[PDB]
């Protein structure tokens, strides 16, 4: 039919995630990051991780 | 139980006067405690 | 001193008319002026503004990208801990919004 | 996002003097699918539980 | 602008109404350990950035240290407005409080 | 005008001639109210907690 | 720039502006330059040519 | 249904007589709330004049609309209630965290607001084919634009020439366009039609 | 923190309430579009996060 053959939005999503997935990882993977320090004296540093 | 009490504010609009030393510790203004428990104001001569 | 001056305080502006810390920015100038702080949530897109008096020029303001602005100048600083700014970036996500009643009016 | 403003562009394209009454149920079907897709990565996002 | 005017009145007689009166003061006439230690230090904060001094340095280079002898002769030009859990208030000059 | 000026990797001429401008005038109006700051070491006339 | 030092945090007027005579912007030029005698020097430089044109003159 | 239009300059400029321009100067009372350095424990008032007030001085400014020409009559309000608006000892709050007080003033300021539409009179100091420059009471930038001036108008090599073929001079009367405010000083777009 | 940069404004209450979806779009910087997140030079994706 032409509304059975409408996209079925999950399992698109599936294919769409998994290419962006890939694509975003790689892309990080040869990132470069530059220091950036405060008037203070102070590097920042780029961690999502307060492991205290 | 950061969320619950949080929605809980949200869901009755709530206004925080800011009295609690949790809250001024949050917003980062001085203790009213002690020797926040006061304010101090500086006599100037030749006002008029 | 311990929890706030010699951790994360930071001189941050606000909206005294939304009470927002994260809707302002600094303007971007014409070359020759001076830059102003604004908020991009109490002020109007320039044209939306036309199409509702004269426009006076201190009241418009433009971003980097290039569009104009008609007011949002009810700005100043306040002295908060830098982790505030998160907590209201994070709750904003949300769908959650902070409004800090700034005074003096 | 993407994926369901495209399921929303071809909805448009149906013809309702084609959309049977047995087409109301696959097109119900599949907007069920993308509403339940969207809000659960809504949820990911908010609150992970 | 005209309410801007209302604003301000309505903001000063409030004030006026919390503010209790020299005559009627009910508070200790001792200068309180929390009040002192703040006099210090502010005073001796405005010190730091050349606030006019009315005592004698004698050779001092502690602000607070300055502080201390001007508290100690009564010539910190403070007041200390003491707030009552209403927000009603009392003005105390600090040579006027005792100190101890 | 609130700016840093780091003393480490400095000569004692260099020194020198930063101290002995501790104390000029302001030649500027907007920051004619301050005086500049010495961030010093700690010593014995110190608290700390 | 502009700081807490230099800026007030806040001005309001507190009333309609009232519109003044010539002879009033005078006697006000008059004494506003009187009493202020490297920016303000520059100013009532300023004034000084505004309070002549308003006597006429070049 | 919306009004943020409240931010119309309602106070109208009056055209004159024995004249035929606008009197844009106006004198308007302020309240501002303002910091006091510690050096100026002793003299208040003068700190203010010389922190706040002062720097104002014919620049434009973004609240009252205008360039501040001046200021009279500096009061500071005390932060005591109680006292008597005589006295000349006063309460000015500190700072928690620093040695600075901060304060309401009350003050009376000089204000010249050429609004939009108003009629005002220049000096010409210069003549292009692409504007004409005025100054406005010999202190004032203004500017006609090429096309703000009629369409019979002429040029030549440089300086203009009028409908009848006779050359301008000193002093020209053009209404108000738009008043420029942003950048370094006041500049006033003005037009002939 | 520094003594000789007061602030004079103070924030003295803070009111908890809803992010509509008119005030967003309004102070909205930039609407997001793109999954994609960096190209091959290591850029910013436009319309990406
Ligand atoms: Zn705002």
């Known amino acids: 039919s032409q509304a059975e053959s409408l996209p079925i939005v999950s399992n698109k999503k599936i294919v769409f995630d998994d290419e962006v997935s890939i694509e975003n990882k790689e892309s990080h993977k040869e990132l470069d990051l530059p220091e950036v320090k405060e008037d203070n004296g102070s590097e920042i540093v780029y961690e999502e991780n307060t492991s205290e | 139980t950061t969320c619950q009490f949080l929605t809980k504010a949200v869901l009755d609009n709530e206004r925080e006067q800011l009295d609690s030393p949790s809250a001024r510790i949050v917003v980062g203004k001085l203790n009213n405690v002690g020797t926040g428990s006061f304010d101090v104001l500086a006599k100037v001569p030749n006002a008029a | 001193d311990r929890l706030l001056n010699s951790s994360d305080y930071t001189q941050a502006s606000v909206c005294r008319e939304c009470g927002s810390i994260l809707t302002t920015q600094q303007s971007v100038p014409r070359i020759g002026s001076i830059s102003t702080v604004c908020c991009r949530r109490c002020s109007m897109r320039f044209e939306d503004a036309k199409k509702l008096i004269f426009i006076d020029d201190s009241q418009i303001w433009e971003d980097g990208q290039g569009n104009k602005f008609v007011g949002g100048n009810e700005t100043t600083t306040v002295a908060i801990p830098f982790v505030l700014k998160y907590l209201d970036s994070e709750l904003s996500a949300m769908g959650i919004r902070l409004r800090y009643n700034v005074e003096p009016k | 996002s993407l994926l369901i403003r495209d399921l929303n562009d071809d909805l448009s394209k149906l013809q309702k003097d084609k959309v049977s009454l047995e087409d109301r149920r696959v097109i119900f079907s599949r907007l069920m699918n993308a509403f339940v897709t969207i809000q659960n990565d809504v949820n990911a996002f908010i609150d992970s539980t | 602008p005209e309410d801007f005017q209302q604003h301000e009145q309505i903001r000063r007689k409030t004030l006026k109404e919390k503010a209790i009166p020299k005559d009627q003061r009910a508070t200790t006439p001792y200068m309180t350990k929390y ?37 100690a002769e009564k010539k910190i030009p403070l007041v200390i407005r003491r707030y009552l859990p209403d927000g009603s208030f009392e003005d105390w000059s600090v040579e006027e409080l005792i100190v101890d | 005008d609130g700016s840093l000026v780091s003393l480490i990797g400095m000569s004692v001429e260099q020194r020198k001639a930063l101290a002995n401008q501790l104390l000029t005038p302001s030649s500027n109006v907007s920051t004619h109210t301050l005086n500049k700051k010495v961030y010093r070491h700690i010593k014995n006339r110190d608290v700390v907690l | 720039t502009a700081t807490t030092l230099n800026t007030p945090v806040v001005i309001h007027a507190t009333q309609l502006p009232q519109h003044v005579s010539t002879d009033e912007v005078l006697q006000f030029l008059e004494s506003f330059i009187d009493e202020k005698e490297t920016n303000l020097s520059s100013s009532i430089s300023q004034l000084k040519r505004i309070q002549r044109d308003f006597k006429g003159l070049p | 249904a919306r009004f943020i ?44 004049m010389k922190q706040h007030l002062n720097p104002l001085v014919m620049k434009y400014n973004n609240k009252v609309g205008g360039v501040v020409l001046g200021y009279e009559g500096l ?76 369409v019979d108008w002429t040029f030549v090599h440089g300086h203009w020439v009028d409908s009848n073929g006779e050359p301008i001079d000193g002093k020209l009367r053009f209404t108000v366009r738009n008043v420029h405010t942003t950048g370094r000083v006041v500049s006033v777009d003005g037009t002939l039609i | 923190m520094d003594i000789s940069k007061p602030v004079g404004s103070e924030i003295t209450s803070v009111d908890f309430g809803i992010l509509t979806a008119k005030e967003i779009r309004n102070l909205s910087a930039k609407q997001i579009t793109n999954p994609t997140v960096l190209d091959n030079l290591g850029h910013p994706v436009s319309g990406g996060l």
């Open chain 8, 5 to 48: 239009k409240k931010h119309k300059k309602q106070v109208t400029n009056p055209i004159d007589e024995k004249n035929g321009t606008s009197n844009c100067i106006v004198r308007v009372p302020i309240a501002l709330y303002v910091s006091l350095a510690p050096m100026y424990l002793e003299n208040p008032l003068q700190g203010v």
């Open chain 8, 75 to 150: 009061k500071i309000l005390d932060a005591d209630p109680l006292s008597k608006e005589d006295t000349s000892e006063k309460l000015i709050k500190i700072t928690p965290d620093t040695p600075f007080g901060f304060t309401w003033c009350h003050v009376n300021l000089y204000v010249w607001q050429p609004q939009v539409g108003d009629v005002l009179e220049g000096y010409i100091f210069i003549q292009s084919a692409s504007h004409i420059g005025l100054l406005i009471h010999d202190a004032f930038n203004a500017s006609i634009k090429k096309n703000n001036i009629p």
């Open chain 5, 35 to 71: 009040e002192r230690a703040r006099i210090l230090g502010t005073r001796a904060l405005q010190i730091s950035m050349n606030a006019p001094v009315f005592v004698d340095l004698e050779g001092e280079t502690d602000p607070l240290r300055i502080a201390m002898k001007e508290l």
